Amino acid sequence: IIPTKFGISFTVPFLNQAGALIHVYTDGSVLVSHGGTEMGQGLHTKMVQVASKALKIPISKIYISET
Amino acid sequence: LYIGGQDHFYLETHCTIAIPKGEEGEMELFVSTQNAMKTQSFVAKMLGVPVNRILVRVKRMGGGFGG
Numbered sequence: 078i079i080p081t082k083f084g085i086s087f088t089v090p091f092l093n094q095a096g097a098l099i100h101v102y103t104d105g106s107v108l109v110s111h112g113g114t115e116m117g118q119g120l121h122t123k124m125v126q127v128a129s130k131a132l133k134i135p136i137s138k139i140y141i142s143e144t
Numbered sequence: 145l146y147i148g149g150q151d152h153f154y155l156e157t158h159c160t161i162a163i164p165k166g167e168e169g170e171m172e173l174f175v176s177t178q179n180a181m182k183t184q185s186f187v188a189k190m191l192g193v194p195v196n197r198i199l200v201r202v203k204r205m206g207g208g209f210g211g
């Protein structure tokens with residue numbers, strides 16, 4: 078049986094920064110763009126869940142297309 | 145008094161390329177238009193898809209003049 082601890086952050090301080098860009102179109106559909114990429118880890122899935130919670134709207138009105 | 149109408153005669157006529165991305169109704173369009181917004185909406189409405197799915201790109205027009 079083995080434990081682990083693992084430090085969270087970039088050890089270069091200036092990399093710990095992050096931008097997003099959001100548009101709401103006139104049918105109310107939402108386009109989210111942020112600096113992260115999807116490699117299978119479900120980042121975009123998580124970002125849609127965060128946006129839907131923050132905006133108080135269904136996930137079906139929110140979309141992430143690409144980085 | 146009467147005044148006759150007029151043809152725009154932009155040297156470049158109307159033109160559109162549409163790329164369907166195969167995922168979630170996404171479509172990317174290159175179009176000779178003064179109105180990328182209404183282009184985006186009209187295409188979304190015809191497809192029965194949210195606006196956030198449709199991307200319109202306009203580099204330049206060979207004339208528009210309102211036409």
Ligand code: XAX
Nearest residue numbers: 152153154155178179205206207208209210211
């Ligand atoms: N070379 C060239 N010049 C042009 C145009 C053009 O296609 N080519 N057309 C006009 C029109 S027609 Mo209209 O209200 O949509 S009826 S307004 C308008 C105007 C739009 O351009 P801003 O001046 O707002 O940047 O450009 C003018 N000059």
Ligand SMILES: O=C(O)c1ccccc1O
Nearest residue numbers: 084086087088089090092
């Ligand atoms: O500290 C890290 O884990 C790290 C990871 C990726 C790139 C630069 C970094 O400092």
